Write an enzyme that holds these catalytic residues in place. Structure first.
Site, PDB file in Angstrom:
ATOM      1  N   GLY A   1       1.043  -1.272  -0.032  1.00 31.01           N
ATOM      2  CA  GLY A   1      -0.095  -0.031   0.121  1.00 31.01           C
ATOM      3  C   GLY A   1       0.678   1.243   0.116  1.00 31.01           C
ATOM      4  N   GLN A   2       1.988   1.441  -0.234  1.00 32.57           N
ATOM      5  CA  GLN A   2       2.836   2.437   0.332  1.00 32.57           C
ATOM      6  C   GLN A   2       3.130   3.130  -1.512  1.00 32.57           C
ATOM      7  N   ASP A   3       2.746   4.457  -1.604  1.00 31.53           N
ATOM      8  CA  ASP A   3       2.375   5.252  -2.592  1.00 31.53           C
ATOM      9  C   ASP A   3       2.767   4.659  -4.125  1.00 31.53           C
TER      10      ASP A   3
END
Lengths: 129, 121, 159, 130
Positions: C53-55
């Site tokens: 889920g990190q950018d």
């Protein structure tokens, strides 16, 4: 008339109880997954004071909610609350979401349900819409 | 390291120092109107009438600074809640009437209140 | 059954997956990538794609959209600052043509934390009530205990 | 039909099934009685939880405040109404309100009475002062 004002769900579900504050405008409802305390609206009155001494409100005493009325020609001492001093005022056709006299006294406005109806200052014949 | 140039910058810690710092920048005739001192102060007399009686004292003091003769002792500030306009609505005197007491609230508050009627007026 | 599990970083997606696969609570690292695993529940074999889920990775989910039968969207119920952001990600995900008929299962997670938002609260914030075009469900979960996980697999299997 | 409303969520709290919800007779606090065997009260203006009381280990269906005594009455599946001081935090009194769990309690501020309603098909009256 028992027509549905609102339906509220919360993601808490199964609402077991209700109770209401006796001093009014908080209701609290017990659910399966918790409790909520909820605050209901209407905290403040709608009214306006012109220069004709027709200070108009809606609801209250010597005024109906549906129709429109009120006058306040009393000047008794600033230290206490002054009487209602109402004088009767003619026709209305809508509910007052906000009800207001004109600031120098020529119009009356009752606003309600996405519509404004204008009634004349002290005669209350339909002026405008 | 204490004393800030600011209002604050956030958080209880900074906030607690801040009321100390405020009392410095206006010492003059008590705090008068208590600052962030008010929060701890109630618990200081949790047993239970004594808080109101005390609170009544401060509220009376605050109203005005009168002549300060024999039992006319109200300090704090001269004008900050006045006394007695004739156009003021619904007036200062309504709160002053509480202080005139037969016992109208309870006895601890009563003794404070009778002195306090005497003290403002 | 093919499942895509996404959500913001730290929501608990990998914790959920390996709790389900290993019955174990593992010590995660941020997932720069995906984990893909197969889980058996009641005669269904769910292939779960847990996508970080990190950018940088968030920008890549669209490659995993196609062929997805169901979507698990994990939310950290304790993080109120990022709930709007979650709402924004999920809303445009709902607009994706490859995700058009996929079953939508929200996990409101870390329900174990004292100030966790309730599932109802989360439902209001994510705008879930406004989905009329496909199946949705919200489920309170705790991935560490395992609470709500299989209730999720259950709901999903009834697509 | 139109009406001045504005529904707002003053405070929420998550807990096992709360049978009763109350507003404190004169205080800004609301008490909710939960199936946690606990009753909990929170002042939903400053958003501070003022106090909790563990009435029973089995559901407390009812709870109300007898504001004058500075006490709270609870009725739980102990089939008792247990009374506590909500500022001196201790159990003021313990008594068997009914032969069955107590669904609701009503407080008469002008009289010493609480009548409680229970699912033993009976409502009983208790006088806090005695």
């Amino acid at each position: 008339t028992y027509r549905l004002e609102s339906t509220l769900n919360y993601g808490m579900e199964r609402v077991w109880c209700v109770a209401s504050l006796r001093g009014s405008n908080n209701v609290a409802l017990g659910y399966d997954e918790g409790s909520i305390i909820v605050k209901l609206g209407r905290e403040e009155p709608a009214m306006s004071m012109d220069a004709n001494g027709k200070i108009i409100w809606a609801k209250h005493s010597e005024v109906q909610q549906a129709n429109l009325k009120a006058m306040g020609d009393t000047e008794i001492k600033d230290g206490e609350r002054l009487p209602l001093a109402v004088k009767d005022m003619g026709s209305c056709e809508i509910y007052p979401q906000t009800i207001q006299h004109n600031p120098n006294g020529r119009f009356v406005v009752v606003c309600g349900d996405g519509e404004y109806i204008i009634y004349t200052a002290m005669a209350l014949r339909n002026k405008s819409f | 390291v204490e004393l800030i140039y600011k209002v604050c910058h956030a958080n209880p810690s900074e906030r607690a120092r801040f009321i100390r710092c405020i009392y410095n920048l206006l010492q003059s005739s008590s705090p008068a109107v208590k600052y962030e001192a008010a929060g701890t102060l109630v618990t200081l007399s949790s047993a239970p009438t004594a808080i109101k009686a005390a609170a009544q004292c401060y509220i009376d003091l605050i109203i005005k600074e009168s002549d300060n003769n024999v039992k006319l002792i109200v300090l704090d500030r001269l004008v900050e809640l006045k006394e007695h306009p004739a156009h003021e609505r619904v007036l200062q005197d309504l709160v002053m009437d509480i202080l005139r007491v037969l016992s109208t609230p309870d006895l601890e508050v009563r003794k404070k209140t009778l002195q306090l009627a005497l003290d403002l007026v | 059954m093919r499942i895509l599990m996404v959500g913001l970083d730290g929501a608990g997606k990998t914790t959920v997956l390996y709790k389900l696969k290993l019955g174990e609570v593992i010590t995660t690292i941020p997932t720069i990538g995906f984990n893909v695993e197969t889980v058996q529940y009641k005669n269904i074999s769910f292939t779960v794609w847990d996508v970080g889920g990190q950018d940088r990775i968030r920008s890549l989910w669209r490659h995993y959209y196609r062929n997805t039968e169901g979507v698990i969207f994990v939310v950290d119920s304790n993080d109120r600052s990022r709930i709007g952001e979650a709402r924004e990600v999920m809303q445009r995900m709902l607009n994706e043509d490859e995700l058009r008929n996929a079953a939508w299962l929200v996990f409101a997670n870390k329900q174990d934390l004292p100030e966790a938002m309730s599932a109802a609260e989360i439902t209001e914030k994510l705008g879930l009530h406004s989905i009329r075009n496909r199946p949705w469900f919200i489920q309170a979960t705790c991935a560490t205990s395992g609470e709500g996980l299989y209730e999720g697999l259950e709901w999903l299997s009834n697509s | 039909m139109p009406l001045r409303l504005d529904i707002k969520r003053k405070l929420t709290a998550r807990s096992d099934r709360v049978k009763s919800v109350d507003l404190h007779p004169t205080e800004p606090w609301m008490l909710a009685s939960l199936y946690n065997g606990s009753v909990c009260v929170w002042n939903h203006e400053t958003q501070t939880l003022v106090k909790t009381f563990e009435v029973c280990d089995l559901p407390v269906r009812a709870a109300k405040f007898v504001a004058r005594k500075n006490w709270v009455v609870t009725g739980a599946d102990d089939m008792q109404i247990r009374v506590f001081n909500y500022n001196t935090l201790e159990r003021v009194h313990m008594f068997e309100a009914h032969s069955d769990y107590i669904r609701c309690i009503a407080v008469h501020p002008t009289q010493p009475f609480i009548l409680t309603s229970s699912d033993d098909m009976l409502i009983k009256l208790w006088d806090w002062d005695k």
